[PDB]
């Protein structure tokens, strides 16, 4: 399948933010996805000195959100039920600082108004990306501000860009871990729009629709990637005894209850493309965001079935958009 | 692939429990799985008049449990963190009564002692199985008692047995829904034992490791099963605008936190074999149970990797046992 | 005058079970009947004298949106649905969840055994452990839940030793100081806003009045008075470490699922005023907040008494007082 | 004598922001210093006079197991980790979560920028909305969190208008009746058992003493007294419907994750005694329960004061009293 991108051995010892004169770089990745979703903008910035970065989804009007912080090792700030931005970043818990840069910028744009109903709400989540490089540089307040300032409608930089700079997969053993990236995908169906954004830094591996392992757990001794379960099961036989952060953004009106269950459904669906997933070693966090523009019909019928047009249906479609995004990240 | 088992059109109008002289039947299914797991017994009973039934996992010593009630339409009783039995049943919420039959029987065996530390704890979960038949008979207290009385070590009746009598899959449209069953699978690795039991009554369909839809959403007009997303996406393009209950039982000691995250991981993994899953229309509930007999090593290394022997590893292995069980249920 | 003691006495933790008796449900009348005006809500309470133990059922045939706040560490809950035709509160620990099955079956029969989704009859049940307060193993069974439903009437509630409250008790630092409580209810109408509180306090803690006086539980027969448990706990630590309550709040005010859920949490927390300690590992405290969705609040929350005075929080504060009154009726 | 009023005054909801000022952190001293003996725990409090607003940091360099009970409807939380090297409490609403980033960065520097898993420095942060209580938009920023950490010392806590409590306020039925609170702490030692409570009450509700008297918040300048909010709420309903608190409890007693989580819930609920209403939709109430894992309780829970007297519930009841004392210090 694809050529290996082995991350290589941990190097710990390296310089931190203050050691450098750090210039934000607008991330372009390997290619740009273009899409049509008015009211949603995306910016991505990185420090070459990491390499590490942040990716910001800006919805200036604000949008209702559900968070499904399903992993065992989550790094989350805010996790609000209504957001003006979502900030995804490297740097482990230190990278939550990037969201502060976004928040301050939005406060300035609001002319420092502070009424309850005009608080600018930014939710942030992070990946641990320090094993995939040899510095301690992290996404700081300045980098989050830059990613917001770089945000534009209808573009997403695929691959090694923003939060995906140093994302990696397949962590049974660090000698077999491979660099991933970030990914996005978009579908429009009638008036319905669905955007998926993902930064897969899994303990598990990326798996395609045929069941092929396409990124992570690559053994240079064999030239082949293995599903982790094969390693795990042999490890048990031998010895006993002897994070992915993501967002799904849509324009379909969903109640708080529908939106929450939609988040759970889409998030669980990602165990198709990332295996294992939702593990104690992962901090998997999905944000489900709706711009509340399009009604679903009051009854769920169509020529395709009596129960074919509802939030579960939307969840199933969004799950496919998200798998496409995961595969873009691993490409 | 497999021959269709279409459930056929809803028939509502039918007789309930009191209309019959109801005799419990010991369920044998299509075949018996045999396995070696001392301290775990399984019983299954049904009423032919439904057809509907209950399946009971009895662990007389009691075992630590985590519950992951992830679906939007859950029918759960007890949901305790320590159980002497798990009762899975048809009959929608009415079938929770079967667990009372189990509980009373266990109280009688305890000679009606009622100290806090000898309370007999039964957690129960249910599927809605009324659309797959033409009666209102449900698993009652007598049926739960019978399933417990029928419990034996090391046997599980596959297929149309116990709670699986009238389980069905693929509910975009009732004309395409197919009867499933219940299923189990077992693996032993070194001293580690993992038993998976499942009663798939999903809105979604059963999918095999190649990605083939093997049960549910069968169209008699074409002779072919479809993944629901194909129906959903065309329904949206047209109109906008114009439950699985399961248990994983193991003998590996896990702390409450490990056991809870293990439950979440294994449950999410089932979105590989059941698609969609964890939907608002489903009451998906997984019980993760440990008999707390075997330690994992204090450090997680083996020849297969530095991070290869831990609870996440066990979760990945258990996820495969569960997929095997789902495929047995759909066979 | 301090209330007279109602010590439960020393627990044996067992005795004869249900089938040792020819169990006839008794309609519970308690010590007094509360009467109130809330069409669409009926309450029935039944007991077995042979326990003594019982069940109390709230029946809302329209069905009503519900939030559950299962806050305690030792909860016994069935269903816990976000929409219910009945709530069943019972003794008998986990065994007493069976009473709810009796309610469910009876409701299925009233529905002529129809089983379409819209027709499924939804009963949520919660239990207290009441076996220390008596010397039998009798529990609320399917027949007792059915009886409690059949006895249900609008506008009445039997206070005291009635239904689920038959063998409820408080103050469990030591069983020698535990006292029988009861069940309790209170009701307020503000114009057409209606709030009903029902409670079955079986706390590890004690019942406390609005002055901060301990009024039920932790009665020391050697002193003739009730102290707050914390006095015992702090003395215990100095010595040895040297150097359930089930409840419902029912209202007719429309609240969204989000509002109703937070209203449940607020009202439930408020009960740590009248029950102390509360929400402990030893307790299975469960509150059901139910709205019959009859009355909207104004779109904006202002009044002469303030800019933020008419909203679900406000309703929660009022409901919290109704619930404290119900707790005090249970302890009376 | 009833306490003198400390009305916050009418809110403008905006003003100059951080960069309009040359902001120098000030070490907060408050009205009084609490002194106590708990090695391994340091507290620092810093403010900007230009807000006025501040941050209070609890630093536990060993790291400590933590349970978070984010019970309010309007929570502002970062991290919420089950193991923490620091807890940062701040004003500035969601913007003030930035102070925790300053703590985290400073701790990374102390660790010589090591980034192995075992070395990750974990800071959980929570905030109050304190913008109604002043006419600026200044918030606790990265520099202020750093300063609060640098000012942290063992065995001291500045009571009153200090750190996160600079512009905390209570009683928000109407802003004309809202009063400045402060932050508060209390400490108890029972032998070698140690319990520290820290609280920053910014409630929608009011502070209530052990007699049931409202002592801070909802002061009506037309009457000269404070009433419980429920009086306003019930009058508001009759008229118009005609027919955050952030806190930490730190102990040295070993509790398992399950015990510690239920202990957090218990102690948090107990605060509805001293803050009423509490846990409302309008509030972002968040409690951190932290154990330094130094002392085991006995294996069995007996003492002369009862068979169930020495356990995590008992500790929770004692800790609940320490926390009420801290709330009253904040309101004093």
Residue numbers in the entry:
A (entry chain B), B (entry chain B): 19 to 260, 267 to 355
C (entry chain A), D (entry chain A): 18 to 260, 267 to 355
Anything the authors wrote about it?
Nylon hydrolase (NylC) is one of the three enzymes responsible for the endo-type degradation of the by-products of nylon-6 manufacture (cyclic and linear oligomers of 6-aminohexanoate (Ahx) with a degree of polymerization greater than three) and various aliphatic nylons (e.g., nylon-6 and nylon-66). However, the post-translational autocleavage of the nascent polypeptide between Asn266 and Thr267 generates an active enzyme with an α subunit (27 kDa) and a β subunit (9 kDa). Based on the X-ray-crystallographic structure of NylCA, we reported that four αβ heterodimers (molecules A-D) form a doughnut-shaped quaternary structure.
However, the D2 symmetry was partly altered by mutations at position 122. Plotting the protein stability (Tm value) estimated from the CD analyses against the distance between the two monomer molecules revealed that the protein stability exhibited an inverse correlation with the a2/a1 ratio (index of symmetry). In other words, the ratio changed from 0.979 to 1.197 from the wild-type (Asp122) to the mutant (Arg122, Lys122, Val122, and Gly122) enzyme, although this value should be equal to one for a perfectly symmetric structure. A clearer correlation was found between thermostability and the nearest distance between the side-chain atoms on helix α2 and helix α1. Notably, this distance decreased with an almost linear correlation with increasing thermostability in the wild-type and mutant enzymes.
